[PDB]
Design a protein around this ligand. Structure first.
Ligand SMILES: [Mg+2]
Ligand SMILES: [Mg+2]
Lengths: 591, 592
C-alpha cells in the first residue's frame, strides 16, 4: 500500500495506453508539452469534473488530498516526491528525541538521518533504509525528508539533517518514517546500454545463455520434472555476462565521523564485501549509463564499509556519473584487466551544476513535464544507440560532440521531471534501417539481462526467436557475426522443448496420484467456481496462498504440483519414468 | 489441526454421520443392542477396507488404525483410542535423560502427569498449563504414554514426570514427545439448563434474561451505527444470559504445591486464579456433567490465589461427589445463593457407588462400539429424567431421591461404558410421551448451554426463537411456564422489530454511495468474476477477506466491502445514508 494512501489521499489510475497515445508524438518543444498537459487535463476532467487542488501524478497515476487526506506545508509539486512510494515499513519518533544537525548536505546530499539501531525499519544493527519522513501533528505535515537513513551501534542519538528538509522551519511533535525500500544488495549485471557506451572491444563475445526458474519451477526442476512441464522453456531463458558485480546502496564518506570512524582518502571507496582487497582497482558504476561512457569510473577499493550492503564513495570522485546519496545504487565491477566488460571513463566530463532553473506552476504541470520528458529521454537514448550501430557498420565512430549533447539532453530530460528546464539544442539524426539496437530491444527489452516481471508465456518464444534473424539488422560486422554461436545455442534449446507439451503429463498425473483427501466446503466451492467460470488459475493462486495441503488437491495436477513437497515430486516423476528436464537442457546446450 | 495419530503415521476414515446415527437409533441397555451396533460398525469399515485392521480404534464416525506405517504402541489396542484421535495443537521433545521420574500412583494428583520449568513452546504463561498426550519413544516404537495435564512454574528446576501414571511397558524410549491438545485458557462459566433443573434455586427461571452476541465483524457494524436491516435475521445474535457469571479454569490437585516449592492447602478450601473473591468467602464449586441428584455442585471456601494461571485447585475429598479429576476437567466457581448465585450446594452428601462387574473391552473395535452404543443411552436417560421432573412438577409433586440416584448411576455407567465393559444396572426407563418443558428447552437452548454452539444456518435460527410463543404447548412446572411470559414477550418484540427489515435495499444503496473501486490485481478480478458467474460469491469473499484485500478495492461488492471497511469508513457511509443505528432500535424493543 502506498504512502499517500495511508495518509488518506485519493489514487485514481488511467489505462496506460491513454498516456502512451499522448506521448507518441512528443517533441522537445513548448507546443508538444502543451499537447500533453491538455490531454492529461482531459483524462482527469472526464473522470471527475475538475482538476482537484494539490493534485500530483506520474505516468498513468494521479493522487490528490481533497480534505480527506493529510495536508503539506510544501509547494504542491514537491508533494509528488512523498505520496506515491510504497510504505513497506513504518515507525515513529517523538520530536523531542531528535538532534538537529545543521548545514545542507551535512551527511551527504541525500542522506537525511543517522540513527542508533532500529530493528523496525532496518534489519541490521549497521544497516540502512530508503525513506520518507514527516514532521506532523494531527493532519498537518510541516517538514518532510526524502532519501537514506543509516543505522549504527556507535551512534548514540537520532541525528537528523535539518536544513535538507522541505517545508518551513517549524516542526511538528513527531517524525513519522516510512521505509520505501528495505536493506538489500542489488543484482549487478552489465546492461546493453552500458555495453554500447563503455563496453570493452568485442564485449558481445562474452554473453552466454542461462536459465532462471522462479522457486516454484526450480522445485520441479530439482525433483526431476520432465521438459514437458517447463513448456515453453523460453519463459526461463536469460543472457548472462562472464561475471557479476557488487551492488549496494550508495553512501557518503561524510557519514564516517558521525559513526565515530575516520575519513576516507581521495580517489578511494569502501564496500560491504571482501571480494576486493585494499589497494585494488574496481569499476564504479551508476545508472542511467550515459552515451559518453562517463557512468563508469575507476577508483581504488580501500576496505570494508561500516554499513551493511553499501558502497561509500566521494562526491568529487563520482560526479561524472551524476550520482548522489538519496537512494542511488552503486555498482562495482572488476576492471578490464581483471575480466570486466566496462571500461573506465577518461577525461572531460561536462561540469554540470547550476544554471537555467525554474519551477513548475503546480503538481499537474509537473506531472505533464514528467510524462513529456519521459518520452524524450527514451527517444534520445534509443537514437544514440541506433547511430552507434549505423556508424560501426561503416567503420566510423559517432562524434564525441554528439555523445556529449545526447548526454546533456538525457540529463535535462531527467531534470525536467522535477523542474522546468530549457531543452538544449539537439539534432535527432535520422536512422534509415533496422539496426542491431532494434534487435537488442526485442531480445533484451529494457537492456537488463535479468528480464523484469511481465511477458505473457504466449509471446516469449517469439522474442527468443529473433536470434534467427540477426542478418537483417544493420550494425557492427563482428557483433552480428560473433553472436552466431549464441544464436545457435538458443535455437537448440528452443528446438528441444518445442512440441514437448504439458497436457499429457497433467493427464498422467491425474491417474497416478491417489484420490483427494477430504477437504472443507470453502475449498470445494472455490474449485467449483474456478472450473465453471474458466478461472482455475485465480482459484489455485488463492489456494496456494491459503496453504492448502497437497493431498487435498490430487484431482487438480496443476495445483497439486504447486503444493507437493520435494519427496512427493521426486516419487511421482520416478513412478512415471520421466527423464529430468535438466539433463535434456544440458544436452541441447552442449551440442 | 492435524490429529496426533496422523502425525504418528496412522490411517483415518470419517464415515457419513448418518450411518452411525442410524445404528444408534435403536440402542438399548442390553448385550443384544450392543451387538447390533457392533455388527453395523463392522460392516461400515469392511465396505471401505474389506477387513477390520489390527489395532483399529474409533469414536462416533471416525476410526483410525496404524497399518503398515503408523507408530507402534506397547499398550492394549483399546487404550490407544485415547492418544491418537485428539488434535495436535502444539509439540515439543525432551530427551529421556533430562527427566526426573517421580514414583507413586497419582502422585501429582489423578490426571496431572507433569510438573515442568517454563516451556513457551507449549505453555504461554511461565506459571501456566497444557492438556497433553506424552509418548516415550524410540524411532517408531512408543513404549509408555501419558494423558492429562502438564503444569509449568518458575520455581520448578527440573522436568518432573509421574512415571507410574504412564500406560504401557516400563522401558523408556530416548525422547519424550509432548503434544498439547488444548492450550491454556479460561472457560465461559454460565449456568446450564441441566444444572438449573438439578440444583437451581427456587424460581431460578425468573433470573434468565435476553442478550445479544455479535461476532467481531458484526459488532464492528453495530458500533458504527449500521441499520437493523444489516442484522437480518436478528435471531442469529440472540442468547439467554444468567444474572451473573462464574470463573472457569483447569482443575488441579493441591498435590502439585510441594512440587512448586509452595505450602499446602487446608481441608475444605480451594484456590483459583482470580481476585473476585476474598480469602474466607464461601463459593459454589461445579464440575460437569450436571448429575440428577444435584451432587455436581458443592460449597467450598475460597482461600486465595492459585500459583497457576487460569486454574482452580481443590481437594480430591472435597470434590468427590462431582466425580471430578485432574486430567483436563474444567472447574467452575459460582457465587453462593446468598450472593445471587443460581446453583444450590449439595448437602445429601453420599455418592456411594455400588459395584458392577467390569472388564476391559476385547479390542479398540469393541470399545468403539461401546462408546457409540453408550452415548445414545446416556442421552436418553438424561433427557428423560428432566422430562420426569416436568411431569412431577406439573402435578405439584417431586421425583423421588431414589430415582435421581438410579438415574445418576445409569448416567455414570453410560460414561464409563466408553472406557470399559461394565454391566448395565437395572433401570426402569419410565418414559414420557407428552410434550414437556424439557422439549421446549431442547428447542430454545439446544445442548443446554446459554452460549449457543454456532452451527445453525441463518434460515433456521428465527424458528428457534419463535418457540417462545409456544409455552402453553408444554406440560411442566406451572410457575416456570407463567414466569417465563415477560421473557417470551421481550423475545417477541425483538423478532418483530427486525421482521421485514431485510438487507437487500441497504446493499443496493451502498453500491450507489460507495466511490469507484480503486485498482486491484488481476487475480482478484478473476476470483470475483469466478464467484459471480458460478454462484459462489461467499466462498470468494471469505477468501478475499482472509487474504486481506483493502476495502478501497471492493466498493463494488458491498457484502465484501462491509467485511473490510474501517470503523471510520463504516461510520461515514452510514451517516450519509441517513440510517438509524440498529442498537437504538433494539433498545427500544427491549424496553417496551
Ligand atoms: Mg538521485
Ligand atoms: Mg475425567
Amino acid at each position: 500500500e502506498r504512502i499517500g494512501t495511508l495518509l488518506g489521499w485519493n489514487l485514481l489510475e488511467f489505462p496506460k495506453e491513454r498516456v502512451r497515445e499522448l506521448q507518441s508524438t512528443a517533441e522537445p518543444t513548448e507546443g508538444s508539452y502543451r499537447n500533453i498537459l491538455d490531454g492529461l487535463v482531459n483524462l482527469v476532467k472526464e473522470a471527475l469534473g475538475h482538476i482537484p487542488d494539490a493534485l500530483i501524478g506520474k505516468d498513468n497515476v494521479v493522487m490528490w488530498p481533497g480534505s480527506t487526506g493529510a495536508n503539506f506545508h510544501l509547494p504542491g509539486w514537491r508533494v509528488s516526491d512523498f505520496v506515491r512510494a510504497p510504505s513497506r515499513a513504518r515507525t515513529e519518533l517523538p520530536t523531542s528525541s531528535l538532534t538537529l544537525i545543521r548545514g545542507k548536505k551535512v551527511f551527504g546530499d541525500g542522506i537525511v538521518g543517522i540513527f542508533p539501531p532500529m530493528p523496525e525499519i532496518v534489519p541490521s544493527p549497521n544497516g540502512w533504509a530508503q525513506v520518507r519522513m514527516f514532521s506532523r501533528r494531527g493532519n498537518e505535515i510541516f517538514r518532510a525528508w526524502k532519501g537514506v537513513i543509516v543505522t549504527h551501534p556507535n551512534v548514540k542519538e537520532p541525528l537528523v539533517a535539518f536544513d535538507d528538509g522541505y517545508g518551513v522551519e517549524e516542526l511538528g511533535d513527531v517524525l513519522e518514517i516510512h521505509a520505501i525500500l528495505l536493506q538489500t544488495q542489488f543484482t549487478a549485471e552489465y546492461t546493453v546500454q552500458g555495453l554500447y557506451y563503455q563496453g570493452i572491444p568485442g564485449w558481445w563475445r562474452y554473453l552466454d545463455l542461462d536459465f532462471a526458474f522462479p522457486p516454484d519451477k526450480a522445485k520441479l526442476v530439482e525433483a526431476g520434472a520432465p521438459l514437458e512441464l517447463l513448456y515453453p522453456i523460453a519463459q526461463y531463458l536469460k543472457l548472462k555476462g562472464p561475471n557479476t558485480g557488487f551492488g549496494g546502496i550508495l553512501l557518503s564518506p561524510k557519514i564516517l565521523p558521525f559513526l565515530g570512524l575516520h575519513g576516507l582518502e581521495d580517489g578511494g571507496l569502501l564496500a560491504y564485501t571482501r571480494r576486493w582487497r585494499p589497494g585494488e582497482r574496481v569499476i564504479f558504476n551508476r545508472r542511467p549509463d550515459l552515451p559518453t561512457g562517463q557512468s563508469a569510473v575507476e577508483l581504488t577499493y580501500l576496505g570494508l564499509s561500516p554499513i551493511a550492503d553499501s558502497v561509500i564513495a566521494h562526491e568529487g570522485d563520482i560526479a561524472s556519473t551524476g550520482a548522489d546519496y538519496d537512494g542511488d545504487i552503486g555498482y562495482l565491477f572488476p576492471t578490464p584487466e581483471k575480466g570486466g566488460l566496462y571500461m573506465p571513463f577518461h577525461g572531460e566530463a561536462l561540469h554540470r551544476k547550476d544554471l537555467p532553473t525554474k519551477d513548475y506552476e503546480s503538481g499537474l504541470h509537473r506531472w505533464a513535464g514528467q510524462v513529456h520528458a519521459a518520452h524524450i529521454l527514451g527517444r534520445v537514448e534509443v537514437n544514440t544507440r541506433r547511430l552507434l550501430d549505423v556508424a560501426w557498420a561503416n567503420g566510423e565512430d559517432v562524434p564525441q560532440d554528439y555523445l556529449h549533447a545526447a548526454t546533456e539532453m538525457i540529463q535535462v530530460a531527467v531534470d525536467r521531471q522535477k523542474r522546468d528546464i530549457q531543452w538544449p539544442d539537439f539534432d535527432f539524426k535520422s536512422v534509415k534501417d533496422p539496426v542491431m539496437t532494434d534487435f537488442w530491444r526485442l531480445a533484451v527489452p529494457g537492456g537488463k539481462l535479468t528480464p523484469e516481471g511481465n511477458t505473457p508465456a504466449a509471446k516469449i518464444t517469439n522474442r527468443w526467436r529473433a536470434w534467427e534473424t540477426l542478418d537483417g539488422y544493420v550494425g557492427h560486422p563482428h557483433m552480428k557475426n560473433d553472436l552466431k554461436p549464441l544464436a545457435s545455442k538458443i535455437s537448440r534449446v528452443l528446438a528441444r522443448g518445442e512440441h514437448r507439451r504439458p497436457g499429457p503429463v497433467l493427464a498422467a498425473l491425474a491417474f497416478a496420484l491417489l484420490a483427494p483427501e477430504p477437504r472443507p466446503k470453502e475449498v470445494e466451492d472455490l474449485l467449483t467456481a474456478g472450473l465453471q467460470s474458466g478461472k482455475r488459475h485465480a482459484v489455485y493462486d488463492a489456494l496456494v496462498q491459503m496453504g492448502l495441503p497437497a493431498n487435498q488437491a490430487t484431482d487438480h495436477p496443476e495445483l497439486w504440483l504447486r503444493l507437493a513437497s520435494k519427496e512427493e515430486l521426486e516419487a511421482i516423476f520416478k513412478q512415471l519414468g520421466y527423464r529430468p528436464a535438466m539433463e535434456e537442457l544440458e544436452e541441447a546446450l552442449n551440442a
